[PDB]
Paper text:
The 20S proteasome, which is composed of layered α and β heptameric rings, is the core complex of the eukaryotic proteasome involved in proteolysis. The α7 subunit is a component of the α ring, and it self-assembles into a homo-tetradecamer consisting of two layers of α7 heptameric rings. Interestingly, the human α7 subunit, one of seven heterogeneous α subunits, self-assembles exclusively into a homo-tetradecamer with a double heptameric ring structure, while the α1–α6 subunits are under equilibrium between the monomeric and dimeric forms in vitro.
Numbering used by the authors:
A (entry chain A), B (entry chain A), C (entry chain A), D (entry chain A), E (entry chain A), F (entry chain A): 2 to 245
The structure:
Amino acid sequence: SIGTGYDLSASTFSPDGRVFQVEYAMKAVENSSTAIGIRCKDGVVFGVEKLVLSKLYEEGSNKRLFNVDRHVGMAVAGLLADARSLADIAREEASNFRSNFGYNIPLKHLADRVAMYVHAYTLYSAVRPFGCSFMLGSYSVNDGAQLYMIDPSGVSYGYWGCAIGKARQAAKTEIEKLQMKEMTCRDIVKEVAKIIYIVHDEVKDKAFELELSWVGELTNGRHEIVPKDIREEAEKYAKESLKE
Amino acid sequence: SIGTGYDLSASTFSPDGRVFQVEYAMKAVENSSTAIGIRCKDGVVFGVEKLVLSKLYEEGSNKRLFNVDRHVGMAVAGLLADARSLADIAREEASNFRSNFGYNIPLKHLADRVAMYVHAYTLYSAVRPFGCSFMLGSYSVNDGAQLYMIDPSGVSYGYWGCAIGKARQAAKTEIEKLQMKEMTCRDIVKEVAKIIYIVHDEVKDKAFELELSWVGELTNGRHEIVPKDIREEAEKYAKESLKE
Amino acid sequence: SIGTGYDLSASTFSPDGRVFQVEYAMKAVENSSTAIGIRCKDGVVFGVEKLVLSKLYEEGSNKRLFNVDRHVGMAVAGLLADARSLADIAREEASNFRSNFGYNIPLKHLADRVAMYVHAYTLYSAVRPFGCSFMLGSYSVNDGAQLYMIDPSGVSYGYWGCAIGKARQAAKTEIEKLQMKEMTCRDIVKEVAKIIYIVHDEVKDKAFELELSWVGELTNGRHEIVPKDIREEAEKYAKESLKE
Amino acid sequence: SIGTGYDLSASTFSPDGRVFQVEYAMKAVENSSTAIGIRCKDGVVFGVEKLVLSKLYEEGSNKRLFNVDRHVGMAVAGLLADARSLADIAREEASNFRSNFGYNIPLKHLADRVAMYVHAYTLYSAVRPFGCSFMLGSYSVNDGAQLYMIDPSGVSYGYWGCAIGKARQAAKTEIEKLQMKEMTCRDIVKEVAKIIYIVHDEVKDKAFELELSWVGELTNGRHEIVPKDIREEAEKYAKESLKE
Amino acid sequence: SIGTGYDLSASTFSPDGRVFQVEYAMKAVENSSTAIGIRCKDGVVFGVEKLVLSKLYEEGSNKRLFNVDRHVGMAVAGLLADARSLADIAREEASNFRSNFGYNIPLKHLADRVAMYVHAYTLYSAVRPFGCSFMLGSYSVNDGAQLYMIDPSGVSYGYWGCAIGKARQAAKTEIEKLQMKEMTCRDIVKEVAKIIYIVHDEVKDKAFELELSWVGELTNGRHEIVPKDIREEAEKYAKESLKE
Amino acid sequence: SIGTGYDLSASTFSPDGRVFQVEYAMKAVENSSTAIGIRCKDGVVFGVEKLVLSKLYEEGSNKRLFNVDRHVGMAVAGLLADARSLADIAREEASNFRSNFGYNIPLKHLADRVAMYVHAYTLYSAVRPFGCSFMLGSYSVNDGAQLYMIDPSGVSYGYWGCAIGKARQAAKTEIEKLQMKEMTCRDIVKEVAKIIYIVHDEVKDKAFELELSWVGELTNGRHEIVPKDIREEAEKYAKESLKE
């Protein structure tokens, strides 16, 4: 509890140098499950630790993945409603950005403006800043496969392999173990689902379901969801890992 | 009472990661009675636990169901006045959305914008956020039977069977028991009124009245209220359940 | 005193789920006297417990009834000045609503917009929300006799017989006793003044004067005040009740 | 051909004192058929000389009568398209005028503003002034049966019996013969259809069809079209006249 | 050549009563080929006399039919570029009109506003009025099969069978011969293509191609083009007529 | 010289039906040289009859081809300055249109809005309408190879092979001779340069230079100019034709 009076409406700084809304949003991220994203050599594919709680839900729904453009997706974590509001405002802002650019969409300045809108609600006191994270990734030809992760603190870090959520530590160690630039996207995403559901603890956390969505060379550049054969294949691949 | 100074105007985060307005609105929902909604295979029909208190009321009035379009309804719970304000603003926004679309109304982006307006009043300090919930459901042909539940935290979750209100736990277990995709809407809605008024405790809660409203194939796609023969039929069906 | 820090500017929620401005406005209503309204089968007539305090007042003045349209009246309770401001803003809004509609005025969406303006000042912090209540009632032919009661919490409940003010409990029991749909308006309003001035306690409360105003079939659809013969007749009728 | 250079864009006056656009619009009116309107003692009913040309038309369509409000109609003559534009703009202006007034709609200032909009397009040079005429008539209780005829020159003349169109001379003589204030509306409108289709010359003009629409006491104040029994009855009544 | 100085910028009237822009636009319509539209009992189907001139054209292109909504089409004649501008502005205005209405689109006030925009450019002098015609037709269930023809003079006439273009006289006689309300749409549209390409003179006019597009019961309410089997079937049907 | 007083500022119509600005712009087009465009099966490639007059010019400059997007070009004819203004305004409008659309750019509604801006300056009198023509063509994968020709009269006609300029007659006959849909783009564009410089008369017209620019499959979808080897190859191919 660092801060007495500082952390009330902490747009005002404390002499540690820690804006306590950033700790709000980060701890809210580590309250939610661990979703990662990776920038392989001919695609950018995301993955979400989706949590099964009951039978009243809907499969295919409860989706923490969100299309932004034809090949731009949004792998959210944190709080879902503000992330969907960010998805809508980023939809209109990606409309403005493929206005601005002539070719297919160059994710750099796109994610810069999206992170600008993220950090713009972080120095006032009307409502809260966005206590959620999300990952933007685009695959192209004239500019290639790009991946950028907008933190809740507005400092958008790009990655060849990223990790947000609860168990970010083991996830980022295992991402820094893998060959994030070398192999093709398909084996690497099998390894992604494999190792992330190794990281899934089945006792402290409840039941789980695979959540993943393509974009790359074999999917004709479309931001496709992972199909049911490849979904069950990655499920069996993670089960081969978890049986050991 | 998690939060000392955090939960004053809790647009500012606390280091747990829990925006305390969301707990305001959720506990306000569990203070009100339990209303559910279900997405059957040829319709989307809602249901409200309506509470009888006195004879000064009006039957047909005290309606916690609200038409939004010709086949779009709003099954509210929480606080009624802000829910009716949301009904009016969603009426103009559904006007803007059936402006935007060419066919009959595609509830997805509709409920996205409605949940955006829900979460937009959740980071300021002029007045409160909406301490109420509501369910949007549309039945169509070119896009089908769609159901979406906008939480008070702005993360609109769609469902094949949903549940909000006080006794959400037993209600969502019984919804995850039923065949929410398999049987026709009529037997399923009989089972809905049946099991929800099983869940109605007559001692801790006061007297009750059935509240339900159609839209589906037999109702010519009109968002009709359940008629008095089908109302008394579902009453007798729930009484057949409650006699056991 | 539920709420420590919550109830300062309680647009922010407390984890009970009770927006404390609603308790401000409701307790302010139960501080003021008990005024009721009833929707009989060929009219909508209001009634106010008017309190005699001194001889410096003016009879015909101190009116807690307010015309809104030619057949739309406003039976206020709570605080009078904000209720008159609501009367003025509802005058311009009823102007906008009989702009919008072609026939005589359909009170439903009218009272919806009025209750929207009521609840719109309930989530900010510049000045207070409206700590007062009022009843809207319209009698027509193409749409009939309609009655709607806008609470201070913005959830406008319609009634066939309503009751607001201090002694709402005994008043609403006696309204749920009477035949609010069956007899003609004239005998029912005699019973209204009768039973409401039975409910008037002459010891704890000070002296009283009858306040009532017609609209119905015999008054040519005009929102007339109750005339002096019918006023003294209802006074004598309540005295016949109170002599027992 | 009075005017050499004057009548080019005759917003500029000629020293006769005749704005030649008024002669454009009047001669355009006398090019179209003769439609009259009459203000009887408990209604205001219009009538149009409708011209049958071929079988490709639609009966009930080709309507030169236009509803403006629930009891306000528009009996047009001249050019039909600008008259329908005047019908639309008068629809929004009647919306603004039943905004302004509290009771049912007082046609006087309504037709004043409509004639103001008529004459407002008569001193410029972008497009033409309205080369058409129309009759406004309202029947009420608090203000009664009112009839007003807006000329194309903007000087709205009210009438107890009016006449516009081609054979205005014989029509206005026969209107000044009849009892426009004395008898009930039904016999008078039978006499209207009678004498106007006496005035219809079947050789110089082509085939004809009766066009008439009620508003009055028997029609519950609704601006109804004349029903088929009363239509064929007035046809037979005019045939009884024309057989002589 | 009626009018010396009048017909220069003929927003100013001449004392005949004939706005010479209406003669511009009508003679421009009779310069273009004859396209008709008909309102059969379960659909509204259009037809265009398309003129084959060379092999450099594109079949399926040179389309004088234009979709406005999912079941609203635009059968143009006159000048094509201003008709496509009217198609675009009517696209945004139909967006505004299915904003305004709750059910499927009621063509009446739609075509009223479109004809208002037609006549609005007819009294100024910046550029020309629209020297082209078009036909709007909608098929529905709650409001049915509606057909409306907006003339270039802004007086939108609805029809059960219409005809615009060059040989309007023989076309409208043959439309007033046929059973425009009685038979099903399919045989009637075969008769439409039959008789209209009887009316096509192959000597004075050059080569022709069938142009027709459905909307009705068998086409699932979609404004479909006539398929190639039904196109060649109607070609052979017109050839069976023309062989006699 | 059809029209006495009509053709002064001919936004006003003449009773022939010929807006004389369209004849201004068309005769201005036939004053300039003949440029064609063709929609082959895997590309849309343009071609301009460029006229050599002196040595003071610049090769690569005097370009009557204009890039609009990465694969959208503009083959102009008529007057060059207004065509470059149309190129700039179409650049911003194509920015607005690839705002609006999600995939690569769908030329249909693009050219519709561009032709709307063309025809929008054709009914006023401040400055002239655009006395020039231009051809828009886009090659894609999700929507394909599209070609559209915006006339100066605003009626944008799409083509599989088009022709504008001076000798449009022989050019369009030879385009309707060729296989505009069958062969690959490369041989067809060789035939284009071949036959168009057959059509070039070297006596009445002065010296000429080849002007052509690709977009298609071999050019990686880039709107490339024809390279110097393929330029001189098409020159030699046209010389092989012209030697006969």
